[PDB]
TrEMBL record, chains A, B:
<keyword id="KW-0899">Viral immunoevasion</keyword>
<comment type="function">
    <text>May regulate immune response to the intracellular capsid in acting as a T-cell tolerogen, by having an immunoregulatory effect which prevents destruction of infected cells by cytotoxic T-cells.</text>
</comment>
<keyword id="KW-0945">Host-virus interaction</keyword>
<dbReference type="GO" id="GO:0005198">
    <property type="term" value="F:structural molecule activity"/>
</dbReference>
<protein>
    <recommendedName>
        <fullName>External core antigen</fullName>
    </recommendedName>
</protein>
<comment type="similarity">
    <text>Belongs to the orthohepadnavirus precore antigen family.</text>
</comment>
<dbReference type="GO" id="GO:0005576">
    <property type="term" value="C:extracellular region"/>
</dbReference>
UniProtKB/TrEMBL annotation, chain D:
<dbReference type="GO" id="GO:0005576">
    <property type="term" value="C:extracellular region"/>
</dbReference>
<keyword id="KW-0899">Viral immunoevasion</keyword>
<dbReference type="GO" id="GO:0005198">
    <property type="term" value="F:structural molecule activity"/>
</dbReference>
<comment type="similarity">
    <text>Belongs to the orthohepadnavirus precore antigen family.</text>
</comment>
<protein>
    <recommendedName>
        <fullName>External core antigen</fullName>
    </recommendedName>
</protein>
<keyword id="KW-0945">Host-virus interaction</keyword>
<comment type="function">
    <text>May regulate immune response to the intracellular capsid in acting as a T-cell tolerogen, by having an immunoregulatory effect which prevents destruction of infected cells by cytotoxic T-cells.</text>
</comment>
Amino acid sequence: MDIDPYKEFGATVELLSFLPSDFFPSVRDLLDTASALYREALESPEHCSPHHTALRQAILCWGELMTLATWVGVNLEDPASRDLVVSYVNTNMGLKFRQLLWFHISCLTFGRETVIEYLVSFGVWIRTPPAYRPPNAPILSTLP
Amino acid sequence: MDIDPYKEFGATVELLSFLPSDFFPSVRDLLDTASALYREALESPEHCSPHHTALRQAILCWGELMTLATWVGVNLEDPASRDLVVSYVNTNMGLKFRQLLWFHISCLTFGRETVIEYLVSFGVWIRTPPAYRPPNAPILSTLP
Amino acid sequence: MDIDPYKEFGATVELLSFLPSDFFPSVRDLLDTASALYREALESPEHCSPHHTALRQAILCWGELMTLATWVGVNLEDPASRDLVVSYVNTNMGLKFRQLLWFHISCLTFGRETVIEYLVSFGVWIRTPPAYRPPNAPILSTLPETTVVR
Amino acid sequence: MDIDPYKEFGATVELLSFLPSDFFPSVRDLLDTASALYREALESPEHCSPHHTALRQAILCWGELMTLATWVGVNLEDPASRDLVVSYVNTNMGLKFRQLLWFHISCLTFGRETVIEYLVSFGVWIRTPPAYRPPNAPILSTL
């Protein structure tokens, strides 16, 4: 099964590649935003939304990966190898889950259509070469 | 954040641990069942069901966990350690994911209420002394 | 004060004295059935049923007995004495609390009248001599004789 | 499970911790009161009240604990460890069970709301410093 966790919603892994890897906030900041804005909804026993379901699952997924990495590192005896494996994790699983959490939190806060239009607009902005790129990058906001 | 994944479906980790650990089919068997029965639905751009969303997320998480495991295993060179770490990841993460995939596949196939009643019935059955319980173990079936 | 814990429910200790020890699941299995089936109602702040009240009190006192026995054993210095106290508790209080928890869980699941009818039938079966009673004991279950869920 | 034996009624263990450990009457006095006032109600085949159910269970299971304690003491070696066992049984199980018996008997006799109000009032009384603490400790009464 070649499953794309976004085509269920309307985006694709290549639509989120418009945003660079250095754009997404850290996992700590994303989970803090989740606990701040959507905590009661996430622990509610209701199917509040597909975004809520996917977000619950993703949070538990990162919990499992962090448990595994912590146990492996605790049993590990070589700190250089520990740094290498934590860099590998943060590079691949870290980036993938930062993408997932950014997408779901933003679709909950501002809206799925707005998030997809923002993806297209930021793709345009980041494709435009710097000499002709506006200093005001596009951003999701509920204010003028 | 204290997220219980089964809660939004009406179940609990206490209810899925109410069944034995060696009852749940292997992760390969469950993934094969998923690919054989609901591949076109898991790869389709539709919120077919909360079970479909949770199943997509669980499959992707198992892929990521196995990716981390095989990467660290290929980079390491200790066979006893391979055995220890594979046993650890199995008995914890593989058990959690066996419970998850079993629950979701069985729900999609038979019914959420049917799966919950099966949980309670099979638990009481395994706990009842043999001479005072029905001789055959309970099992879910589509054939009338 | 000559209190019968089942009398308020219409059963009696003489009616539950026919069920053999092998008929009841272990105290751990019964407490697990409770925790997995009616935990939300047993921890709730509202009276749900006389069975729920009696079951709460039974679980609490089983815990207290267990803590007492654990303290006694930890203090004690003889392995044979530890085995003896464990055997005594498991044959005197273990069986009684198995009876109580089984009764209340089964009344919550199936029904009080159904448990009482099953007790009468099991009494007949268990008092009938072996060469004259059917080989399979009467069964109180939530499943048919095929044990296949659809 | 975290079953609180008073939660279904309206009190908690945090609420009953207001009263000290030396305040509750002895199990003998509590069982004598229970007998004299509600023997026919606790021996009757009726769910007269959740308080009656809890009181029946408490009486029988305290008798169970006493049977275990007497067997252990009869089998034990020396009066030193015997009195140590008895002191442990008292300070923990006897205290908890006279808490339970006091709560349910007082509820049955005066009223559940009255018992909870009495708990709050006794908390206030026991927190007030002695120089300003009245000698008339709060007491449950009908007349």
